[PDB]
Structure formats: structure tokens, C-alpha cells
């Protein structure tokens, strides 16, 4: 009937419009994408914000999945449309459509990862949780192994809790802090006032954001084909361009 869509607030994917109710209270790349996939797929839907404000990780002790991944695994939501990175750990428990947006871990400064690793004057870190932190923690690649060893025991802490906190840390560190985040957010922030941040070097890895459904869900096939069609039509490119550049401030 009404498909339950779990999502999360993260600019410019989903934001509260700056007097409204329901789905109209929200706006953003993922809000427009949700309307497009629902249209193609022919379904009615309700956008809900994830209760714990998490993306999805499996607790080491309890072994239960939190965030949006959890809402799908434990049947509280039918689909998740947000900047949810496709990873092997999450793929084992849920289905992802073909990526609707490409990305890679990147470097944000006010060069290369290898350059950051073999240096010591510019501090650097990631979010305290997430796919980016996990990439470093589990990487067998020498350069990233070295970066992780440095980050995990750096005093004071090089980690931050939100994107906004990492961005702020960069801006106020006068060239002494590099923030490792997804290139998508790096590109977005570069077009935001005071226009004082920049992405340097190539990405450290390669993946995408995908629409997620419960393993074996009937909606899966349809949402994947819709993603392929929107991409082919150039719609996903126009949509990223709208929210990143058309709406840029620099």
C-alpha cells in the first residue's frame, strides 16, 4: 500500500525545508530521487527518518544491525533511499540497486593519501563510525594500514562525529587538518560558503550509494531497473548537478 521509506538527514540528500506535513517537509537529492523511483515503479510511499540516526553497522556484542540497515533487516521499513554506501558487510544482509551515485573516500583540505601517510605535520582523521572508518580499520593495503595505525592512536583525537564537525575542523585548522570523507560530500562542501575547502588527489577507493531493500524483497528488481533507466536518461546526473552545482554558493 504505502511503502515505508527510511532515510536520514544529511545535506544535500535530505534536509528539512527552510508549515508543511508528510513528505513535503523534506527536500534534497534523495527526496527527488524517491519521488522519481516511486513514479517509475508506481508505488505510494512515506518518508520516515531513522530513529537512531545511524546508517547501518552490526553490533559486535549483540550482533544486531542498527540504523537504516536494521530497519530493513528487522522488517520495520521496505526501502532506504539515502547516502548509504554499498559495502560487502551490508550487502551480506540487504540488497542494493546499481549505484545511483558514484564515490570514493577522498581528502578535504582548507597530493595523495600516500603523501598524507608519509607526512606528520598535517593531522588527519575520519568520522568516529561509518564506512570510511571501517575501510581504514580493515584495509590490508600498506598506505591505508599506516594511516589507520596513526589515526587510531593520535592524541588528541583526529576523529569527528558528523560531516559538519569534520568540515569545521578543516576550516579552523589553518592547513593542519585534512578530513577524509566521501568525495560526494567533499564536492558538495566545496560549493558552500565560505568556499574555503578543497578536494585534493584522487579517491582512495571506489563504490557508490545504492537504494536498499530487504534481501528477497519484491521491490528490489523494480527499483534497480528504475535506477538504471533514470541513469540512462541522464536524470541522475542532472539531479546531482542541481543539488551540488546549480544550488552552489561559490
Ligand X SMILES: C=C(C)[C@H]1CN[C@H](C(=O)O)[C@H]1CC(=O)O
Binding-site members for L-glutamate are: 83, 85, 90, 131-132, 182
State the distance between the two ends of the chain, measured CA to CA, in whole angstroms.
43
How far, rounded to the nearest angstrom, does the alpha carbon of residue 220 sit from its chain's CA centroid?
20
Could you identify the residue written with the cell 545535506?
Answer: 11
Contact status: 85 vs ligand X (CB under 6 A):
yes
Which of 106, 131, 183, 224 touches ligand X by CB under 6 A? 131
Which of 83, 99, 125, 210 touches ligand X by CB under 6 A? 83
- Residue closer to ligand X by CB (options 125, 214) is 125
Which of 7, 10, 31, 170 touches ligand X by CB under 6 A? 10
Rounded to whole angstroms, how far apart are CA atoms 28 and 244? 10
DSSP state of 191: T
- Residue closer to ligand X by CB (options 10, 71) is 10
- Residue closer to ligand X by CB (options 43, 159) is 159
Q: How many CB atoms lie within 10 A of CB 64?
A: 11
Contact status: 182 vs ligand X (CB under 6 A):
yes
Contact status: 163 vs ligand X (CB under 6 A):
yes
Contact set for ligand X, span 109-128 (CB under 6 A): 127
- Residue closer to ligand X by CB (options 30, 181) is 181
> In sequence order, which ranges of the chain are alpha helices (DSSP H)?
29-41, 67-73, 88-91, 113-117, 131-138, 142-152, 163-172, 183-190, 219-232, 235-241
Amino acid at each position: 500500500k504505502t511503502v515505508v521509506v527510511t532515510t536520514i538527514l544529511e545535506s544535500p540528500y535530505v534536509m528539512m525545508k527552510k508549515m508543511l506535513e508528510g513528505n513535503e517537509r523534506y527536500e534534497g537529492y534523495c527526496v527527488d530521487l524517491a519521488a522519481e523511483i516511486a513514479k517509475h515503479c508506481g508505488f505510494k510511499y512515506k518518508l520516515t527518518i531513522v530513529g537512531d540516526g545511524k546508517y547501518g553497522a552490526r553490533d559486535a556484542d549483540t550482533k544486531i544491525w542498527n540504523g537504516m540497515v536494521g530497519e530493513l533487516v528487522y522488517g520495520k521499513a521496505d526501502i532506504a533511499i539515502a547516502p548509504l554506501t554499498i559495502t560487502l558487510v551490508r550487502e551480506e544482509v540487504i540488497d542494493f540497486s546499481k549505484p545511483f551515485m558514484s564515490l570514493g573516500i577522498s581528502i578535504m583540505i582548507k597530493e595523495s593519501a600516500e603523501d598524507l601517510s608519509k607526512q606528520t605535520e598535517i593531522a588527519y582523521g575520519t568520522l568516529d563510525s561509518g564506512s570510511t572508518k571501517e575501510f581504514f580499520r580493515r584495509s590490508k593495503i600498506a598506505v591505508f594500514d599506516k594511516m589507520w595505525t596513526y589515526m587510531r592512536s593520535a592524541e588528541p583525537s583526529v576523529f569527528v562525529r558528523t560531516t559538519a564537525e569534520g568540515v569545521a575542523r578543516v576550516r579552523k585548522s589553518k592547513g593542519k587538518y585534512a578530513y577524509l570523507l566521501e568525495s560526494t560530500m567533499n564536492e558538495y562542501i566545496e560549493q558552500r560558503k565560505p568556499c574555503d575547502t578543497m578536494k585534493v588527489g584522487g579517491n582512495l577507493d571506489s563504490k557508490g550509494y545504492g537504494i536498499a531493500t530487504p534481501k528477497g524483497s519484491s521491490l528490489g528488481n523494480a527499483v534497480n531497473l528504475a535506477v538504471l533507466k533514470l541513469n540512462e536518461q541522464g536524470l541522475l546526473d542532472k539531479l546531482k548537478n542541481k543539488w551540488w552545482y546549480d544550488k552552489g554558493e561559490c
